[model samples]
Target: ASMLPQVKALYPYTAANDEELSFKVGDIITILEKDEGWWKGELNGQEGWIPNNYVKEIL
Candidate 1:
């Protein structure tokens, strides 16, 4: 599958469940999969989903 490689949160997000990826500004994530307006990725030591609008790609 394709990957974004690097991304970071634009604003803070708090996960309500295991399906959502919670993150703070400056937190880095590794994109694993994407779906329409959402993405599943690994942040720190956890993996979950985050809104596509909530993050920006980093080189």
Candidate 2:
């Protein structure tokens, strides 16, 4: 199973979500919906989405 790198803060990593909430570094998230260049992820037990460009996956 692959893991994802957490985000620094609630910064808009992409232009789609508009000030999206991201996971902090070392935080764990589950990738929910995957699109062309974005993904709907779950963080902090909260269901939200994020862009794929801003995250690095751990295999």
Residue 43 lDDT in candidate 1: 81
Over 4 Å off in model 1, which ranges?
Answer: 1-4
Best by lDDT: 1
lDDT of 2 by residue, 1-59 (tens): 76454433333443345434455545555676676776677776666667666666555
Model 2: CA > 4 A from native: 1-20
User: Candidate 1: lDDT over CA atoms?
Assistant: 0.86
lDDT of each: 0.86, 0.58
Give each prediction's root-mean-square deviation over alpha carbons: 2.4, 5.2
Compared with the true structure, model 1 gives a TM-score of: 0.84
List model 1 lDDT by residue over 1-59, tens digit each. Answer: 66467788898999988898889998989988888898898987899989888889887
Question: In terms of TM-score, which candidate is strongest?
Answer: 1
- Cα error, residue 23 of model 1, in Å, equals 0.5
Give candidate 2's error at residue 18 in angstroms. 8.9
